[PDB]
Amino acid sequence: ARFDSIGGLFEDFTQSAAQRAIEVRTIFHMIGDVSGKSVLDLACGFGFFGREIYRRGAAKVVGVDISEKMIELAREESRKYGDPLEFHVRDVANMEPLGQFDLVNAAWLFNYADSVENLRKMFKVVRASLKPDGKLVAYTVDPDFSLAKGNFAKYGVNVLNERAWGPGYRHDAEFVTDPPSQFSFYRWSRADYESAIADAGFSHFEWQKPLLEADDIATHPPGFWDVFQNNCLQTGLVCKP
Numbered sequence: 503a504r505f506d507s508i509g510g511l512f513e514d515f516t517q518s519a520a521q522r523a524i525e526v527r528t529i530f531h532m533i534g535d536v537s538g539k540s541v542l543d544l545a546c547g548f549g550f551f552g553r554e555i556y557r558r559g560a561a562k563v564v565g566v567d568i569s570e571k572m573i574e575l576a577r578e579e580s581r582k583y584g585d586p587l588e589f590h591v592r593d594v595a596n597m598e599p600l601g602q603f604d605l606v607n608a609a610w611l612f613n614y615a616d617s618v619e620n621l622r623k624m625f626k627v628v629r630a631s632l633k634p635d636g637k638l639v640a641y642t643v644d645p646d647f648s649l650a651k652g653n654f655a656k657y658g659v660n661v662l663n664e665r666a667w668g669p670g671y672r673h674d675a676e677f678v679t680d681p682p683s684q685f686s687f688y689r690w691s692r693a694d695y696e697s698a699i700a701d702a703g704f705s706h707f708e709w710q711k712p713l714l715e716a717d718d719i720a721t722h723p724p725g726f727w728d729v730f731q732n733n734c735l736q737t738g739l740v741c742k743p
């Protein structure tokens with residue numbers, strides 16, 4: 503697992519990157535009220551979203567990550583904060599269902615599907631993890647990002663290259679950390695996302711713009727967010743059966 507070599511540097515990135523506050527705000531906007539819900543947090547990393555979802559009143563939270571090192575970090579945080587989250591090491595593309603939840607949160611899962619066939623398998627696994635009236639809240643790479651239109655290093659993610667891969671693109675990148683931490687991600691097209699969504703059994707879905715807000719603009723020099731708005735690397739997504 504690539505994040506076995508990143509470990510705590512990812513949390514360092516979340517504390518220094520300008521984009522992270524926008525991601526977090528947008529995701530909690532899409533999630534809404536979590537009181538009493540069962541929640542599955544996929545690609546959970548050290549558990550940030552599932553843990554804050556628990557703190558906001560969720561009934562039960564389970565986290566899944568392909569990285570044994572990241573899950574060991576997640577488990578240690580739960581011990582440190584005395585919280586009841588449970589974690590599993592799995593590749594979400596090939597995992598067996600863990601129950602049916604009110605809410606699946608997948609912040610930075612689908613951009614790690616390394617083929618369009620695995621993108622489709624992931625959406626089917628998510629649908630099988632949902633009750634009929636549940637919902638998926640996802641955060642992923644915007645299909646329209648183009649490396650030539652502007653890099654994202656000033657917001658925290660230095661994208662290094664761009665290469666055709668299957669019907670999409672693959673990108674090497676690094677989180678802007680001390681020292682930088684390398685990873686690779688995949689940019690699948692909007693059509694392929696929407697096809698994977700429909701074929702998994704989600705009859706409703708909507709893309710969600712990142713919630714850049716007035717105070718974000720006020721606390722940087724004018725134009726700081728121009729690349730973020732003109733060549734955004736990220737987008738939200740909500741799906742319902």
Ligand SMILES: Nc1ncnc2c1ncn2[C@@H]1O[C@H](CSCC[C@H](N)C(=O)O)[C@@H](O)[C@H]1O
Nearest residue numbers: 505545546547550567568569593594609614
């Ligand atoms: N196929 C897969 N199945 C499960 N987890 C995966 C995966 N591919 C990548 N990941 C995990 O996805 C995580 C991306 S980092 C994002 C962590 C967390 N969602 C947060 O936003 O705070 C890493 O921990 C990585 O190991």
Ligand SMILES: Cn1ncnc2c(=O)n(C)c(=O)nc1-2
Nearest residue numbers: 610613643659686687735736
């Ligand atoms: C995990 N994670 N966290 C924050 N931001 C990103 C990101 O921009 N991209 C492109 C990405 O693949 N993964 C991210």
